Amino acid sequence: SRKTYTLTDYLKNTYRLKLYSLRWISDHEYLYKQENNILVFNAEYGNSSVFLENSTFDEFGHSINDYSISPDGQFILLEYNYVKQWRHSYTASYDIYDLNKRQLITEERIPNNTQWVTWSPVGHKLAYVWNNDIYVKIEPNLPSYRITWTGKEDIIYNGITDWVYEEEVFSAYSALWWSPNGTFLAYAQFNDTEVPLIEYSFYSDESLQYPKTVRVPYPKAGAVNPTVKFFVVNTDSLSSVTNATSIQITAPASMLIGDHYLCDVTWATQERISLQWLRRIQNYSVMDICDYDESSGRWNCLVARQHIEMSTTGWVGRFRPSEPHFTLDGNSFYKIISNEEGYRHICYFQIDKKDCTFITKGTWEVIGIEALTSDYLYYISNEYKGMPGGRNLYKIQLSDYTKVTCLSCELNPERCQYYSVSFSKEAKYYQLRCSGPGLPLYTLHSSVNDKGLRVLEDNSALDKMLQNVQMPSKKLDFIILNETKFWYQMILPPHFDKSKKYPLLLDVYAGPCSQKADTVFRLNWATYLASTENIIVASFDGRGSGYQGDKIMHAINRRLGTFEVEDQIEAARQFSKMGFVDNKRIAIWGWSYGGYVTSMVLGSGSGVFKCGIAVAPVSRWEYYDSVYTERYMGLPTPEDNLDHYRNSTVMSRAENFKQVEYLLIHGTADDNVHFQQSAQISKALVDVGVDFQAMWYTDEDHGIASSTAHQHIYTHMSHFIKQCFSLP
Amino acid sequence: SRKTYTLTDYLKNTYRLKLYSLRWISDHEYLYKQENNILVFNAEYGNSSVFLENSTFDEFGHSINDYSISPDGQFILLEYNYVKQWRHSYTASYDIYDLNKRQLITEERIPNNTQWVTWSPVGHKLAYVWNNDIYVKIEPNLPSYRITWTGKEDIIYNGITDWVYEEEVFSAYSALWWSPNGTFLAYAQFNDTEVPLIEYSFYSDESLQYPKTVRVPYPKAGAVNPTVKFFVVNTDSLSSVTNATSIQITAPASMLIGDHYLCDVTWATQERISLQWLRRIQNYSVMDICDYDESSGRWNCLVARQHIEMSTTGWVGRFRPSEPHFTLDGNSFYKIISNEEGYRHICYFQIDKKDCTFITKGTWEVIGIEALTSDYLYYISNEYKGMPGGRNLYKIQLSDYTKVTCLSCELNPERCQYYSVSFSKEAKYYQLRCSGPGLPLYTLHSSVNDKGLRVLEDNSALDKMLQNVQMPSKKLDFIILNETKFWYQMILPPHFDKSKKYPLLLDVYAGPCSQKADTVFRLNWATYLASTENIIVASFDGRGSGYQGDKIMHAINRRLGTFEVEDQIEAARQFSKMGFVDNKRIAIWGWSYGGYVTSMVLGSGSGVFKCGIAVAPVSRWEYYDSVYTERYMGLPTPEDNLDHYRNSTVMSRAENFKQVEYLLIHGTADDNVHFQQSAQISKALVDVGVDFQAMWYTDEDHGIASSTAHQHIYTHMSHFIKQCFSLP
Ligand SMILES: COc1ccc(N2CC[C@H](N)[C@H](c3cccc(C)c3)C2)cc1OC
Ligand SMILES: COc1ccc(N2CC[C@H](N)[C@H](c3cccc(C)c3)C2)cc1OC
Ligand SMILES: *[C@@H]1O[C@H](CO)[C@@H](O)[C@H](O)[C@H]1NC(C)=O
Ligand SMILES: *[C@@H]1O[C@H](CO)[C@@H](O)[C@H](O)[C@H]1NC(C)=O
Ligand SMILES: *[C@@H]1O[C@H](CO)[C@@H](O)[C@H](O)[C@H]1NC(C)=O
Ligand SMILES: *[C@H]1O[C@H](CO)[C@@H](O)[C@H](O)[C@H]1NC(C)=O
């Protein structure tokens, strides 16, 4: 189509995908920002209005970064002075504006450097975290109420996660939890006291004479973990003459035996809380169900309703114990479990009863549970057409499980195989957002009798543009290795010719429970290599990958750097055989777990790879964190799994890089995979005298994501593959 | 048709340069190790006796790093467990061997981890420093007495120097100096209590889980500096029970008004010390002369006896103020002073007089005073043939200063033009080492009639071998810039063909008072690029280089990054306009100051260079140490030189790097020139979208010196250069 998808295009975002992030405020209303206007839409009639103008906050004085309107549209929250921290954490300054007046509140302002703020899910209450301590405001313009006093930088964490808990448990800086009533604030408290500190330089502005030493409590594999406690406080009982009484919930006796984690917090009623707990060795979780006791002010967790999950083949859950979805009354829940055959399905649990009944069964898995009315449970799975790369909305009749209706399979079979959904409060309606293989297609429906109300976004604008570009095409078959199908994808060059011979970059992640072979439509770096460089970028989902059941996913257990590695090689050795790939020119790249694998791949003696880039890789498991690593690897002790911690380093293969061209990249200020692991790689490559190219990004963290640095890495990498391939 | 000088040859040191290290013991004998024996030789008749048999300590249990024998006979020190700190500093363990018995001393040993040890200049007394505190041994089997009790790690330094003093002041760990008697023991104290700390990671063996943060007190340009007191102890009054009395020597009033350094300590007679102090603004220097008072037990430095050095032109001395050589009676001394015409020549000062008398004059400079007698002074200059880049030994009779003989000039004018020298006590004999342009020659001579005696080592072994390889030849000549001669050398490929058009590598250092163009014979990396890769490696001494008088050296005063850079460019251009250098292939590289300049050049826009390599550069003067930088730049305050400190950063020039190909190398443990510096450069080159090559070296320091890192960095640099030049 004459023009080509270009490196600058990718880097400078010539072609933006349109989205439709709506926020539901009820059973039949969502909020939507249009450029800078905030609009409320009626889902039923499609009619809408200006809720808040883009102009309303012009004489405010600080660039506004986000809003958060109270769940009664009474007050709006204004987030400014945003300073980022790790992957979710940050600090920000806040203001509360009253919507029934033309007025910001002057009195008792939320203080600067707030680590976290949140409305109640009803009315206009606030919890915030300032200096690792929890505060509470009934009324926006009232003195706040302190709830903790134990907080201490880097040592005591009240209502907020420490590093491990942010990245590897809760996927959230948040460790607060309102009861639906807004009555009860529940919260976690972490004790980071004897957690060793990762240390590294941050150089900052040129003007900074001496570089600063950044120090973060970070348990690497085998070190001391943070400890956790749980508490529930009662907001309606708060006195300002008196201190507040948290009530400690303690953990199941069978957890206190040794180290453990609080992994899941789900409220169930106005008065019932569900806590989950994971043993340090992550194959034993225990759910507890705790009820308020209006007479004694206590919380009680009866053993009778305690439940247990324990993996016998690997670890519990995909990355953790599943979320349990609770039927309205509070006496039953559904939650995804590994069935007896290894596949993950919806399971039905009744509070004081034994076992659970499974409502779904088969050679596919459920991805998640999305909503629960009284007649139906709604859920996403990968059942359709046996595509583990796919995702679709399903609906189950509760009074007969066998009655399932695929709400999404058939709406657009050619453009659509990957969905996600956003149910309205009480599930009267839902936004369906398709993600490929064609352009993102945002629709809106009603559960009643599933009636397609309205298209909300179709990317027509982008669809017109992309017609001028000689786009790559995406292939998505699978190979057989033993008797098993493992899936792979190929981003193919325009005017593809299976007669010709093409360079192949093997794009890897391949960590535990990964999926790099899907139907999602993506505009990215691989999009460029293919369109402009006629380079076949393949990916492959082999042993240890997700969504195909424990036999594949758990093949990797206590054994990283083994199967996942070999199998990438294998996939290549297959691709090679195929008539359109020139084997003298096969490459491999990867970031995070992916960069780990690539390096291991290159140091394997395979013969199959000319070159590869590896980006901020892991090099030795003892360097990466406890919660993630030990989930997969056990403990680095002689009596547990030390041997294999030592068999699976990048360092011990070093000699083999003699036979390949290697580019290794790391951001100095990566709090996640520390520069250490790359630093150790280079030293070994040095000790043994092997040439390789390098690049550090002073101050860049794990993302290497600042717009300037981001452009730099893809440029550098683009030159490297272009040169490694003989590309002019 | 012979083989060629190859990277291997260089890296594995195939062709070795044999040496003749000796230590004069008296005016007639000297020590020498020969097949691991320690021998004493007679200078007069050639004959040698075995001082320490190679056999002894075959059974010591430890490998011995160095030995050291009492001046007066009877003991030898054994140095084992050496652990390198900085450039001169290190830690080790010691045993004493009593020569009048097959016996090591058992009792009262020197402690492990000792910081410094010294015999006194006569007898067998020991002065040692351990945990920053000074200890003295009257006999080696007796308990030592303790002199200082104040030493505290990274804070108070008794008898050893700290980082700046070590690196920039005494080129030494030792901050100890005995009287010639061995009666007194003067030592300096350093107080780094408020000196800021540079910190960087050390990653250690891949088995170290958590990176160690190294903290080194290191005053950066304009930072708080260490302070120094100075002391002298009578070692002939020591008591087993009552602490030792260190008499303090106070700096002069005109150093005590602001920050200052102690920068030279010479004993004159048994009872007289010479101290040179130096203001922090290195403009102004005082020498103080202190006699001992038999009655008072105190030390007095008569004011009227002070000797002041100024400079309007730059700083005092080549790198620090110069060293006084005293007459036997200690009422006069000779010392290298820059003269009226800017040239460094020899001056005769009388203690209780105030001016001096120049004893040499000319359009050449004195490099060093080598030996003084009742009759003769001996020195080294670059007078011969007006070749500032060569060195000869000369001789003045003191009864007539015009009566001057050269002693080395005519030994072999084709072979030898770069001497150093080594005189027995009372300059009765001397050893001459010629370092080029031929293979080094080591001779022994008689002072009486300046007669030839014996050839020590003549490297005839190397000569045999070199006859089998295609060695590059050297051109050492000059060019004219604004009516001034400036010198360069070229390392020319064999069978040089002036009508062919060779590629040029510019080898730069160019720091204040450097000299890259000279008559010495090196077997190095230039050798290989010339002999194998047919690359002219050329060096050039532009403005700010030394040994040619102050007009050239001080041109750079207060303005580094400027003329030394223009003048490097200019050189390259004139190398262009020679019919043997192809201008499309001009590279440049350097280390330390070499890299600052390489970097500054590459980013000047001259577009006269295709590519360069900067190894551990400075990048902003505010990052480098106070003593060095402020010598040539003054302070980085707005009242001083802040403006220029800013004008002269690598960073300001990131844009031009678009033109050139860059390769930024640095080790991560660089205590000297901190990684910070290169980190800031690449952050600049990223901020503005310039591709470039880089290479960190894990845990290496400024000299990237370890066997594996040395072999590597040179490999890497060779790939980059050959490819820069279309050389396969
Ligand atoms: C929100 O986007 C996320 C969240 C988590 C996330 N991972 C969380 C679990 C692991 N920490 C994972 C990872 C990062 C770095 C190295 C390794 C081995 C694994 C990274 C990745 C990610 O996008 C790539
Ligand atoms: C023995 O070899 C030495 C000794 C000292 C020495 N210098 C000591 C004085 C200065 N610190 C000098 C220097 C200037 C600028 C930058 C750097 C890193 C070093 C380096 C250099 C050197 O070889 C190059
Ligand atoms: C945190 O833990 C340490 C020891 O692990 C303990 O001494 C300290 O008091 C604890 N603090 C709190 C408030 O939990
Ligand atoms: C050299 O020989 C003479 C005569 O025997 C002797 O006195 C002298 O000690 C010898 N020199 C050495 C090195 O011992
Ligand atoms: C010194 O080191 C040795 C080990 O080499 C040890 O036996 C000795 O006790 C140490 N301590 C002393 C004597 O300072
Ligand atoms: C030590 O000296 C002897 C004879 O003096 C020499 O021949 C031998 O090779 C040497 N051996 C050692 C221990 O180096």
mmCIF file of all heavy atoms in Angstrom, chain A residues 199 204 206 209-210 218 622-623 676 679-680 682-683 690 716, chain B residues 204 206 209-210 213 218 221 622-623 676 683 691 698 712:
data_model
loop_
_atom_site.group_PDB
_atom_site.id
_atom_site.type_symbol
_atom_site.label_atom_id
_atom_site.label_comp_id
_atom_site.label_asym_id
_atom_site.label_seq_id
_atom_site.Cartn_x
_atom_site.Cartn_y
_atom_site.Cartn_z
ATOM 1 N N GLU A 199 20.775 -1.641 47.337
ATOM 2 C CA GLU A 199 21.437 -0.357 47.248
ATOM 3 C C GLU A 199 21.982 -0.184 45.860
ATOM 4 O O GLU A 199 22.448 -1.158 45.234
ATOM 5 C CB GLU A 199 22.513 -0.271 48.312
ATOM 6 C CG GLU A 199 21.900 -0.474 49.700
ATOM 7 C CD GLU A 199 22.802 -0.066 50.818
ATOM 8 O OE1 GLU A 199 23.969 -0.526 50.821
ATOM 9 O OE2 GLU A 199 22.338 0.700 51.701
ATOM 10 N N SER A 204 20.942 11.512 39.173
ATOM 11 C CA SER A 204 20.101 12.712 39.141
ATOM 12 C C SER A 204 20.610 13.711 38.100
ATOM 13 O O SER A 204 21.440 13.366 37.255
ATOM 14 C CB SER A 204 20.003 13.335 40.545
ATOM 15 O OG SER A 204 19.147 14.465 40.592
ATOM 16 N N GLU A 206 22.593 16.586 36.276
ATOM 17 C CA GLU A 206 23.959 16.977 36.090
ATOM 18 C C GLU A 206 24.417 17.764 37.301
ATOM 19 O O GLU A 206 25.429 17.435 37.903
ATOM 20 C CB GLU A 206 24.031 17.854 34.850
ATOM 21 C CG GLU A 206 25.156 17.498 33.928
ATOM 22 C CD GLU A 206 25.509 18.634 33.016
ATOM 23 O OE1 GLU A 206 25.959 19.700 33.531
ATOM 24 O OE2 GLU A 206 25.333 18.459 31.793
ATOM 25 N N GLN A 209 26.358 17.118 42.476
ATOM 26 C CA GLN A 209 27.780 16.881 42.597
ATOM 27 C C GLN A 209 28.106 15.423 42.972
ATOM 28 O O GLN A 209 28.936 14.761 42.317
ATOM 29 C CB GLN A 209 28.411 17.890 43.549
ATOM 30 C CG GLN A 209 29.892 17.702 43.692
ATOM 31 C CD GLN A 209 30.620 18.943 44.156
ATOM 32 O OE1 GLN A 209 31.570 19.384 43.498
ATOM 33 N NE2 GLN A 209 30.201 19.507 45.294
ATOM 34 N N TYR A 210 27.443 14.910 44.003
ATOM 35 C CA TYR A 210 27.690 13.550 44.463
ATOM 36 C C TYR A 210 26.424 12.685 44.304
ATOM 37 O O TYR A 210 25.352 13.061 44.843
ATOM 38 C CB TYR A 210 28.055 13.577 45.924
ATOM 39 C CG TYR A 210 29.382 14.204 46.342
ATOM 40 C CD1 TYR A 210 29.476 15.584 46.648
ATOM 41 C CD2 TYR A 210 30.526 13.393 46.560
ATOM 42 C CE1 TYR A 210 30.680 16.136 47.128
ATOM 43 C CE2 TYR A 210 31.736 13.944 47.029
ATOM 44 C CZ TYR A 210 31.805 15.312 47.306
ATOM 45 O OH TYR A 210 32.997 15.836 47.757
ATOM 46 N N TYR A 218 14.122 -5.011 50.367
ATOM 47 C CA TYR A 218 13.869 -5.843 49.215
ATOM 48 C C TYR A 218 14.400 -7.188 49.645
ATOM 49 O O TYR A 218 15.604 -7.320 49.890
ATOM 50 C CB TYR A 218 14.651 -5.313 47.994
ATOM 51 C CG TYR A 218 14.446 -6.054 46.664
ATOM 52 C CD1 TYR A 218 13.849 -5.417 45.563
ATOM 53 C CD2 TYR A 218 14.866 -7.372 46.499
ATOM 54 C CE1 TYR A 218 13.652 -6.099 44.346
ATOM 55 C CE2 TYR A 218 14.676 -8.057 45.281
ATOM 56 C CZ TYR A 218 14.073 -7.417 44.208
ATOM 57 O OH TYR A 218 13.908 -8.094 43.011
ATOM 58 N N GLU A 622 18.940 -16.137 42.933
ATOM 59 C CA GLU A 622 19.215 -15.614 44.239
ATOM 60 C C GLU A 622 19.244 -14.074 44.245
ATOM 61 O O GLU A 622 19.263 -13.476 45.305
ATOM 62 C CB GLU A 622 20.528 -16.215 44.767
ATOM 63 C CG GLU A 622 20.449 -17.684 45.285
ATOM 64 C CD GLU A 622 21.693 -18.533 44.941
ATOM 65 O OE1 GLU A 622 21.962 -18.758 43.729
ATOM 66 O OE2 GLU A 622 22.393 -19.000 45.875
ATOM 67 N N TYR A 623 19.232 -13.418 43.083
ATOM 68 C CA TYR A 623 19.240 -11.931 43.046
ATOM 69 C C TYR A 623 17.859 -11.337 42.985
ATOM 70 O O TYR A 623 17.637 -10.226 43.494
ATOM 71 C CB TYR A 623 19.992 -11.360 41.842
ATOM 72 C CG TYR A 623 21.454 -11.696 41.751
ATOM 73 C CD1 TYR A 623 22.101 -11.685 40.528
ATOM 74 C CD2 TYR A 623 22.191 -11.991 42.891
ATOM 75 C CE1 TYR A 623 23.423 -11.992 40.435
ATOM 76 C CE2 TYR A 623 23.507 -12.303 42.804
ATOM 77 C CZ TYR A 623 24.125 -12.297 41.577
ATOM 78 O OH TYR A 623 25.447 -12.622 41.516
ATOM 79 N N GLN A 676 22.875 -5.233 39.183
ATOM 80 C CA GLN A 676 23.616 -6.390 39.656
ATOM 81 C C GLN A 676 23.608 -7.591 38.728
ATOM 82 O O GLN A 676 24.676 -8.148 38.428
ATOM 83 C CB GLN A 676 23.090 -6.818 41.022
ATOM 84 C CG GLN A 676 23.556 -8.191 41.467
ATOM 85 C CD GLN A 676 23.051 -8.553 42.842
ATOM 86 O OE1 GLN A 676 21.834 -8.618 43.086
ATOM 87 N NE2 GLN A 676 23.984 -8.798 43.761
ATOM 88 N N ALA A 679 25.330 -6.796 35.661
ATOM 89 C CA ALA A 679 26.718 -6.555 36.101
ATOM 90 C C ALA A 679 27.427 -7.881 36.267
ATOM 91 O O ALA A 679 28.560 -8.062 35.825
ATOM 92 C CB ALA A 679 26.762 -5.757 37.380
ATOM 93 N N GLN A 680 26.734 -8.840 36.848
ATOM 94 C CA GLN A 680 27.337 -10.138 37.011
ATOM 95 C C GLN A 680 27.491 -10.830 35.674
ATOM 96 O O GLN A 680 28.482 -11.492 35.435
ATOM 97 C CB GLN A 680 26.574 -10.964 38.039
ATOM 98 C CG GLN A 680 26.715 -10.394 39.451
ATOM 99 C CD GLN A 680 28.101 -10.634 40.040
ATOM 100 O OE1 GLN A 680 28.932 -11.311 39.435
ATOM 101 N NE2 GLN A 680 28.350 -10.099 41.227
ATOM 102 N N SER A 682 28.240 -9.418 32.788
ATOM 103 C CA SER A 682 29.344 -8.854 32.012
ATOM 104 C C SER A 682 30.662 -9.336 32.590
ATOM 105 O O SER A 682 31.579 -9.688 31.840
ATOM 106 C CB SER A 682 29.287 -7.315 31.875
ATOM 107 O OG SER A 682 29.498 -6.644 33.099
ATOM 108 N N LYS A 683 30.751 -9.408 33.912
ATOM 109 C CA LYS A 683 31.993 -9.836 34.551
ATOM 110 C C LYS A 683 32.432 -11.235 34.095
ATOM 111 O O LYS A 683 33.615 -11.453 33.830
ATOM 112 C CB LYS A 683 31.824 -9.807 36.058
ATOM 113 C CG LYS A 683 33.094 -9.665 36.866
ATOM 114 C CD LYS A 683 32.736 -9.196 38.281
ATOM 115 C CE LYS A 683 31.902 -10.282 38.972
ATOM 116 N NZ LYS A 683 32.150 -10.366 40.415
ATOM 117 N N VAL A 690 35.069 -13.107 26.351
ATOM 118 C CA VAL A 690 34.145 -13.174 25.220
ATOM 119 C C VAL A 690 33.695 -11.765 24.868
ATOM 120 O O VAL A 690 33.421 -10.973 25.777
ATOM 121 C CB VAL A 690 32.942 -14.107 25.543
ATOM 122 C CG1 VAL A 690 31.721 -13.782 24.678
ATOM 123 C CG2 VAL A 690 33.364 -15.593 25.410
ATOM 124 N N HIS A 716 18.943 1.817 19.086
ATOM 125 C CA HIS A 716 20.110 0.982 19.298
ATOM 126 C C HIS A 716 19.871 -0.485 18.913
ATOM 127 O O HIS A 716 20.677 -1.078 18.178
ATOM 128 C CB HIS A 716 20.570 1.090 20.739
ATOM 129 C CG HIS A 716 22.037 0.860 20.900
ATOM 130 N ND1 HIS A 716 22.985 1.643 20.270
ATOM 131 C CD2 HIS A 716 22.726 -0.073 21.603
ATOM 132 C CE1 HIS A 716 24.192 1.202 20.578
ATOM 133 N NE2 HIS A 716 24.063 0.162 21.385
ATOM 134 N N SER B 204 31.125 -7.797 43.550
ATOM 135 C CA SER B 204 31.889 -8.919 44.046
ATOM 136 C C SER B 204 31.522 -10.187 43.325
ATOM 137 O O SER B 204 30.830 -10.137 42.319
ATOM 138 C CB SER B 204 31.669 -9.080 45.536
ATOM 139 O OG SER B 204 32.660 -9.909 46.077
ATOM 140 N N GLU B 206 29.931 -13.513 41.982
ATOM 141 C CA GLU B 206 28.511 -13.814 41.730
ATOM 142 C C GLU B 206 27.776 -14.466 42.921
ATOM 143 O O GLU B 206 26.541 -14.563 42.903
ATOM 144 C CB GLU B 206 28.316 -14.632 40.441
ATOM 145 C CG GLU B 206 28.842 -16.050 40.515
ATOM 146 C CD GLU B 206 28.314 -16.935 39.397
ATOM 147 O OE1 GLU B 206 27.136 -17.399 39.471
ATOM 148 O OE2 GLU B 206 29.097 -17.176 38.445
ATOM 149 N N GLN B 209 25.107 -12.112 47.470
ATOM 150 C CA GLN B 209 23.691 -11.857 47.238
ATOM 151 C C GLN B 209 23.404 -10.366 47.043
ATOM 152 O O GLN B 209 22.903 -9.959 45.981
ATOM 153 C CB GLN B 209 22.852 -12.466 48.363
ATOM 154 C CG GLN B 209 21.395 -12.136 48.288
ATOM 155 C CD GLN B 209 20.504 -13.339 48.500
ATOM 156 O OE1 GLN B 209 19.867 -13.485 49.550
ATOM 157 N NE2 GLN B 209 20.440 -14.208 47.493
ATOM 158 N N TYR B 210 23.740 -9.566 48.058
ATOM 159 C CA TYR B 210 23.465 -8.131 48.051
ATOM 160 C C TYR B 210 24.729 -7.298 47.855
ATOM 161 O O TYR B 210 25.634 -7.357 48.689
ATOM 162 C CB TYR B 210 22.850 -7.716 49.363
ATOM 163 C CG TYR B 210 21.400 -8.040 49.529
ATOM 164 C CD1 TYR B 210 20.995 -9.314 49.913
ATOM 165 C CD2 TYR B 210 20.420 -7.053 49.368
ATOM 166 C CE1 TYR B 210 19.647 -9.616 50.104
ATOM 167 C CE2 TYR B 210 19.077 -7.343 49.553
ATOM 168 C CZ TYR B 210 18.702 -8.631 49.919
ATOM 169 O OH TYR B 210 17.380 -8.937 50.112
ATOM 170 N N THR B 213 27.777 -1.432 49.398
ATOM 171 C CA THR B 213 28.012 -0.023 49.050
ATOM 172 C C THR B 213 29.331 0.485 49.641
ATOM 173 O O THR B 213 29.476 0.616 50.866
ATOM 174 C CB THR B 213 26.890 0.983 49.467
ATOM 175 O OG1 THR B 213 25.618 0.557 48.990
ATOM 176 C CG2 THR B 213 27.181 2.358 48.870
ATOM 177 N N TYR B 218 35.906 11.846 49.784
ATOM 178 C CA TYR B 218 36.464 12.319 48.510
ATOM 179 C C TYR B 218 36.003 13.756 48.169
ATOM 180 O O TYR B 218 34.879 13.952 47.647
ATOM 181 C CB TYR B 218 36.072 11.341 47.395
ATOM 182 C CG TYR B 218 36.595 11.661 46.002
ATOM 183 C CD1 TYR B 218 37.446 10.785 45.360
ATOM 184 C CD2 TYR B 218 36.196 12.804 45.307
ATOM 185 C CE1 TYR B 218 37.922 11.038 44.072
ATOM 186 C CE2 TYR B 218 36.671 13.077 44.026
ATOM 187 C CZ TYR B 218 37.538 12.181 43.414
ATOM 188 O OH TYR B 218 38.027 12.394 42.147
ATOM 189 N N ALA B 221 35.385 19.020 43.444
ATOM 190 C CA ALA B 221 35.664 20.430 43.231
ATOM 191 C C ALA B 221 34.766 21.319 44.100
ATOM 192 O O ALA B 221 33.561 21.295 43.954
ATOM 193 C CB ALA B 221 35.500 20.761 41.756
ATOM 194 N N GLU B 622 33.327 19.639 37.992
ATOM 195 C CA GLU B 622 32.761 19.622 39.348
ATOM 196 C C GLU B 622 32.657 18.199 39.966
ATOM 197 O O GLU B 622 32.403 18.047 41.176
ATOM 198 C CB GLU B 622 31.419 20.365 39.375
ATOM 199 C CG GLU B 622 31.460 21.704 38.621
ATOM 200 C CD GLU B 622 30.145 22.484 38.698
ATOM 201 O OE1 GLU B 622 29.734 22.940 39.804
ATOM 202 O OE2 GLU B 622 29.504 22.643 37.637
ATOM 203 N N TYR B 623 32.881 17.175 39.137
ATOM 204 C CA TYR B 623 32.891 15.776 39.583
ATOM 205 C C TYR B 623 34.246 15.296 40.091
ATOM 206 O O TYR B 623 34.289 14.401 40.919
ATOM 207 C CB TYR B 623 32.403 14.842 38.467
ATOM 208 C CG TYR B 623 30.978 15.080 38.021
ATOM 209 C CD1 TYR B 623 30.538 14.656 36.760
ATOM 210 C CD2 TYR B 623 30.045 15.683 38.874
ATOM 211 C CE1 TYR B 623 29.213 14.857 36.362
ATOM 212 C CE2 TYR B 623 28.731 15.889 38.481
ATOM 213 C CZ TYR B 623 28.326 15.477 37.229
ATOM 214 O OH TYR B 623 27.029 15.708 36.847
ATOM 215 N N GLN B 676 29.809 8.024 37.806
ATOM 216 C CA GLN B 676 28.982 9.222 37.666
ATOM 217 C C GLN B 676 29.246 9.975 36.359
ATOM 218 O O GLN B 676 28.327 10.253 35.576
ATOM 219 C CB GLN B 676 29.216 10.128 38.880
ATOM 220 C CG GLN B 676 28.594 11.492 38.851
ATOM 221 C CD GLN B 676 29.122 12.361 39.973
ATOM 222 O OE1 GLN B 676 30.317 12.586 40.066
ATOM 223 N NE2 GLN B 676 28.237 12.852 40.836
ATOM 224 N N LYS B 683 23.662 9.950 29.605
ATOM 225 C CA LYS B 683 22.356 10.517 29.883
ATOM 226 C C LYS B 683 22.161 11.719 28.981
ATOM 227 O O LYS B 683 21.073 11.915 28.445
ATOM 228 C CB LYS B 683 22.215 10.900 31.360
ATOM 229 C CG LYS B 683 20.769 10.866 31.874
ATOM 230 C CD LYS B 683 20.637 11.393 33.307
ATOM 231 C CE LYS B 683 20.738 12.913 33.349
ATOM 232 N NZ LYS B 683 20.785 13.356 34.749
ATOM 233 N N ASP B 691 22.847 7.922 18.747
ATOM 234 C CA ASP B 691 23.302 6.552 18.961
ATOM 235 C C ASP B 691 24.782 6.633 19.349
ATOM 236 O O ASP B 691 25.462 7.598 18.978
ATOM 237 C CB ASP B 691 23.101 5.643 17.729
ATOM 238 C CG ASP B 691 23.235 4.121 18.074
ATOM 239 O OD1 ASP B 691 22.792 3.701 19.169
ATOM 240 O OD2 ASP B 691 23.780 3.330 17.267
ATOM 241 N N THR B 698 32.291 -4.196 35.140
ATOM 242 C CA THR B 698 31.851 -4.476 36.504
ATOM 243 C C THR B 698 33.058 -4.561 37.426
ATOM 244 O O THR B 698 33.981 -5.332 37.172
ATOM 245 C CB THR B 698 31.123 -5.812 36.595
ATOM 246 O OG1 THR B 698 30.470 -6.101 35.353
ATOM 247 C CG2 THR B 698 30.104 -5.773 37.703
ATOM 248 N N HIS B 712 40.290 -7.618 27.688
ATOM 249 C CA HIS B 712 38.970 -7.327 27.111
ATOM 250 C C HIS B 712 38.877 -5.925 26.501
ATOM 251 O O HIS B 712 38.576 -5.761 25.322
ATOM 252 C CB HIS B 712 37.871 -7.516 28.161
ATOM 253 C CG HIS B 712 36.503 -7.680 27.581
ATOM 254 N ND1 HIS B 712 36.040 -8.886 27.096
ATOM 255 C CD2 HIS B 712 35.494 -6.795 27.413
ATOM 256 C CE1 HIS B 712 34.806 -8.733 26.652
ATOM 257 N NE2 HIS B 712 34.449 -7.475 26.842
#
